[PDB]
Structure 1
Amino acid sequence: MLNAILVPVGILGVFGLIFGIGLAIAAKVFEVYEDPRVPLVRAALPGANCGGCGLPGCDALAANIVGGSAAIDACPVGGASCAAAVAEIMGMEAGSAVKKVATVICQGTCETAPNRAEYYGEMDCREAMIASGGSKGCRYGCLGYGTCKAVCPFDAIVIGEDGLPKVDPEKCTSCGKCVEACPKSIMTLVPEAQEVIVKCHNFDKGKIARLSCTTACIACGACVKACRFDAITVENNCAKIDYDKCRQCYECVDKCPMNCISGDVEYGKSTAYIIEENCIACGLCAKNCPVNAITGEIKKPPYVIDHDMCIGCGICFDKCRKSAIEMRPNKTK
């Protein structure tokens, strides 16, 4: 019983010791690969091979580190919080960003903007662009064959019965796969809190555009005179809104004669809706901010002010020292 226990133990132990020493030696001489600082950013990435990239994959994005060949904020899909998580392994960064969704600047649906001729070929937007640009009467509108839906990886676009795409805000993750795939340059990225958008891309004059579509832009310029923040400009015979200067006052919406500007008139009307707690009867807002809207006498708390006018821009919500004014949208519907 002694020998039958002793012999296999010795044989297997000698084999294991020799193999271990050999592998330990072969750790040197051969591969060392000199690659420090194990990735540690793939866990902070969450990547799904979306496409706002072009370095060969998220794993290669984690493996390309410590060479300094990539930008810190290269991935826009995750956001500034994702960038902070990724680069927080090294640190010295902080930031924030704004969420965005895809949108379609067109509202001509197969009966207000009909077709000039009949098209033969494959049902694709670029294939139709080969056939001399398409068969629609408007040369800037939607073809309706859903290339943007075909290139979407997160299943966020559907094609309606009227021929225009619809985007789900809960499945769209702020990329541009549909933006550079559209042959008409129609898909755009807009902040999620924006409701005032000019939906047209027609670069013709008034008469030709009027003959082409029902809701075309005739470049009259009546929306520019309504805006006092210089946020909407008419260029190339078409109007466009700058979302950085837009206070959402809902004036250009009512002033348009061809119904090109989106949004419904339900806004504002909160002229000095002042909380009585944190105002000292200063009375500085009674004098002037572009409308009258406040006039009275001293206005000790509680304030006695009738509300029938003013535009509800929002500057008075912040310019107060104590910010006693509260804005609540309360109108019809």
Structure 2
Amino acid sequence: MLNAILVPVGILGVFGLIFGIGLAIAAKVFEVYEDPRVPLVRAALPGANCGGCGLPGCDALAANIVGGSAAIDACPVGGASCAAAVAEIMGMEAGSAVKKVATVICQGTCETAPNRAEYYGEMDCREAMIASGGSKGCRYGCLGYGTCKAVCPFDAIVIGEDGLPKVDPEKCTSCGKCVEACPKSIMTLVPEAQEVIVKCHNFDKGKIARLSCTTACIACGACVKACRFDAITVENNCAKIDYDKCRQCYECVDKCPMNCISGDVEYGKSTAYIIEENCIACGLCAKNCPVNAITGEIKKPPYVIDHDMCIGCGICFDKCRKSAIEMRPNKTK
């Protein structure tokens, strides 16, 4: 009766032993020679498989990296957290990458910028670019046929009723596909904190641009004169705002002849709102303050200051050694 149990145990044990010995003697010969750098980076990447960063797929970064050909923030979909994770795996500091959103720099509707010749063909922006360079009255304006919407994989672009595309700030990962896929080179990336943008991609002179569209940049030069910090420049008869030096004083939007800059009059006006606790009545603010909206006598706490008008500025977080001045948006609406 015993042998009926010893026979299958012995047979299966012999088979398992010889097969395991063969597999182990083959495994050491069949050596892959891999490094522990690809397996620990697969859950850090979002794995969206969206080509706007370089190599196809999202499994290509964990075949690269050991060559230094790409930066830590090469993947914009993951963002600051993924960049910091990759940097701390590689052992270096992670930069403070500001989140960016795709934005159209053309505000032209079918009523504002009418066409001059009806178009026949496929409903696409590149196909319209082929047919004698677009059917729009403005040569550089947005066609509105929806190529940027069909390329974006996160469904963050909705074609509006006026023909221009609107980008939802919550669903945009700044992958950069729509920027490359727009034939008119209109789609750009703007920081989320930036509101004052020059929304006209027109390179023509004054009269032609004014005839083509009702909100066209004519390179008059009033916005440059209004700007104090030197952040907006007129090149190729078009205005462009440098987002690094722009402190959002909301003065270029006021002095534009035809509201070419996307902004509203609600800004600043805080003539040195000073916390009473952390200033020693130093009296370094009433001296000039160029427009002279601070003047007082030494200003022992609490500060006796009349608030009537200001410049906005937004730079007085460095003039105070104790940081007593607070900036708050306090205007109409």
In structure 2, do the counterparts of structure 1 residues 222 and 89 end up closer, same or farther at CA, with 3 Å as the change threshold? Answer: closer
Aligned to 1:58, the other structure's residue is in SS state: coil
In structure 2, do the counterparts of structure 1 residues 35 and 301 end up closer, same or farther at CA, with 3 Å as the change threshold? Answer: closer
Deviations 1:213-260 (A, max 9, x none): 111111111111111111111111111111111111111111111110
> Contact conserved, 1:77 with 1:175, CA < 8 A, in 2?
yes
> Contact conserved, 2:51 with 2:57, CA < 8 A, in 1?
no
- Shift in Å at residue 105 of structure 1? 0.8
Structure-1 residue corresponding to 2:262:
262
TM-score, normalisation: structure 1? 0.95
- Shift in Å at residue 28 of structure 1? 2.2
User: In 2, Cα distance between the equivalents of 1:63 and 1:281?
Assistant: 61
**Structure 1: gaps of 5 or more residues:** none
In structure 2, do the counterparts of structure 1 residues 250 and 34 end up closer, same or farther at CA, with 3 Å as the change threshold? Answer: closer
- Shift in Å at residue 324 of structure 1? 0.8
In percent, how many aligned pairs have the same letter? 100
User: In 2, Cα distance between the equivalents of 1:304 and 1:283?
Assistant: 12
User: In 2, Cα distance between the equivalents of 1:310 and 1:38?
Assistant: 56
Aligned CA-pair RMSD: 1.7
> Contact conserved, 1:105 with 1:201, CA < 8 A, in 2?
yes
In structure 2, do the counterparts of structure 1 residues 87 and 273 end up closer, same or farther at CA, with 3 Å as the change threshold? Answer: closer
In structure 2, do the counterparts of structure 1 residues 162 and 287 end up closer, same or farther at CA, with 3 Å as the change threshold? Answer: same
TM-score, normalisation: structure 2? 0.95
User: In 1, Cα distance between the equivalents of 2:306 and 2:70?
Assistant: 59
- Shift in Å at residue 132 of structure 1? 0.3
Deviations 1:156-212 (A, max 9, x none): 001111111101000000121000111111111000011101110111111111111
User: In 2, Cα distance between the equivalents of 1:70 and 1:243?
Assistant: 24
Aligned to 2:179, the other structure's residue is in SS state: coil
In structure 2, do the counterparts of structure 1 residues 72 and 95 end up closer, same or farther at CA, with 3 Å as the change threshold? Answer: closer
In structure 2, do the counterparts of structure 1 residues 70 and 215 end up closer, same or farther at CA, with 3 Å as the change threshold? Answer: closer
- Shift in Å at residue 144 of structure 1? 0.9
95-104 or 81-90: bigger deviation: 81-90
User: In 2, Cα distance between the equivalents of 1:61 and 1:207?
Assistant: 51
User: In 2, Cα distance between the equivalents of 1:306 and 1:188?
Assistant: 42
> Contact conserved, 1:39 with 1:63, CA < 8 A, in 2?
no
- Shift in Å at residue 108 of structure 1? 1.2
> Contact conserved, 1:206 with 1:218, CA < 8 A, in 2?
yes
Structure-1 residue corresponding to 2:277:
277
Aligned to 1:21, the other structure's residue is in SS state: helix
In structure 2, do the counterparts of structure 1 residues 127 and 278 end up closer, same or farther at CA, with 3 Å as the change threshold? Answer: same
Deviations 1:238-293 (A, max 9, x none): 11111111111111111111110111101111102111000100000110233211
Aligned to 2:317, the other structure's residue is in SS state: helix
User: In 2, Cα distance between the equivalents of 1:203 and 1:285?
Assistant: 44
- Shift in Å at residue 14 of structure 1? 1.2
User: In 2, Cα distance between the equivalents of 1:38 and 1:234?
Assistant: 48
> Contact conserved, 1:41 with 1:87, CA < 8 A, in 2?
no
- Shift in Å at residue 15 of structure 1? 1.2
User: In 1, Cα distance between the equivalents of 2:36 and 2:302?
Assistant: 67
> Contact conserved, 2:42 with 2:59, CA < 8 A, in 1?
yes
In structure 2, do the counterparts of structure 1 residues 167 and 86 end up closer, same or farther at CA, with 3 Å as the change threshold? Answer: same
**Structure 2: gaps of 5 or more residues:** none
Q: How many residues align?
A: 333
Deviations 1:57-104 (A, max 9, x none): 322321335566655443233224312212423423333210110111
